[PDB]
Design a binder for this molecule. Structure first.
Ligand SMILES: OC[C@@H](O)[C@H](O)[C@H](O)[C@H](O)CO
Length: 297
């Protein structure tokens, strides 16, 4: 029968999130369902309230991008206990919670692929890395930075029998252009020998590139662990940005909606609790497969 789908987003305040929300809304409608959507505006307490509201409004399927991996456990457990099928998207929820599956980008494997590529590109070069991180305490952010850095190390070990790297500083850019720009400004003042920027998303790296260009600082390789944002892809095609990792907000949403509807309908069972989208490192070689200048994101 007809049932309602709820989509609870932690925030809509970066391009990825806006695109993900619209894709989720669109896919539920395409499949023939009413979609009720909420934006927590970056506030955990509001997201808890949003979930509770969607459950009493009668959603049978809840798609949630959680503001905190721990703080939403009780609300998700209660939704599931009241018969809602819950699919977590993008941000991690503690896997001890009761939900159907977590759909997200393959962050650890992307990081490995991206770090391996860096060594394919620069070889033995002594790396002096400025790190742009998203949000303190974010486990996806941590998986991305440590995935890329450990990928660099592993690739060096395999090729050279030894490894070395230096992270000259870390700034926090809150997943957006302005945040990346400001963090990079600080990093540039602090450090005169940077030869690589590592970002936990493209939006921050794109803002950082503007600080780099304003400062006239040359020789810096741009590396992102996520998401394949179109503006980054365009620069990768031009040779002005090194690599990114694949995290398609619309694919994540569609995957979650399709699987969730199948679960509600009894068409699928014994779903794995982790559902990772295809990993990829995207570079000048393969960018043409992925780049659409007219894309949403
Ligand atoms: O552009 C945002 C994107 O990288 C997203 O996957 C993350 O910010 C994630 O939501 C962090 O949990």
């Amino acid at each position: 029968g007809a049932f309602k789908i709820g989509v609870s987003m932690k925030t809509l305040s970066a391009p990825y999130f806006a695109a993900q929300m619209e894709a989720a809304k669109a896919r539920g409608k395409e499949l023939g369902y009413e979609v009720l959507a909420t934006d927590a505006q970056g506030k955990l307490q509001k997201q808890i309230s949003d979930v509770e509201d969607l459950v009493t409004r009668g959603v049978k399927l809840l798609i949630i991008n959680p503001a905190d991996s721990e703080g939403l456990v009780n609300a998700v457990n209660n939704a599931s206990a009241n018969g809602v099928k819950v699919v977590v998207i993008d941000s991690t929820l503690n896997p001890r919670a009761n939900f159907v599956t977590q759909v997200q980008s393959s962050n650890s494997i992307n990081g490995a692929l991206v770090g391996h590529w860096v060594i394919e590109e620069v070889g033995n070069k002594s790396l002096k890395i400025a790190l742009l991180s998203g949000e303190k305490g974010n486990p996806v952010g941590q998986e991305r930075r440590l995935g890329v850095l450990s990928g660099i190390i592993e690739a060096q070990l395999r090729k050279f029998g030894k490894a070395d790297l230096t992270v000259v500083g870390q700034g926090w850019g809150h997943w957006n252009d302005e945040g990346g720009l400001k963090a990079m400004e600080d990093l540039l003042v602090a450090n005169k020998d940077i030869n690589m920027v590592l970002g936990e998303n493209d939006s921050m790296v794109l803002g950082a590139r503007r600080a780099i260009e304003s400062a006239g600082r040359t020789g810096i390789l741009l590396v992102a662990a996520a998401d394949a944002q179109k503006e980054a892809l365009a620069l990768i095609k031009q040779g002005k940005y090194g690599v990114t990792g694949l995290n398609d907000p619309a694919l994540v949403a569609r995957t979650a909606i399709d699987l969730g509807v199948k679960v509600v309908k009894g068409e699928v069972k014994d779903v794995p609790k982790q559902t990772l989208t295809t990993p990829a490192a995207i570079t000048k070689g393969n960018v043409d497969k992925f780049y659409n200048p007219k894309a949403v994101f």
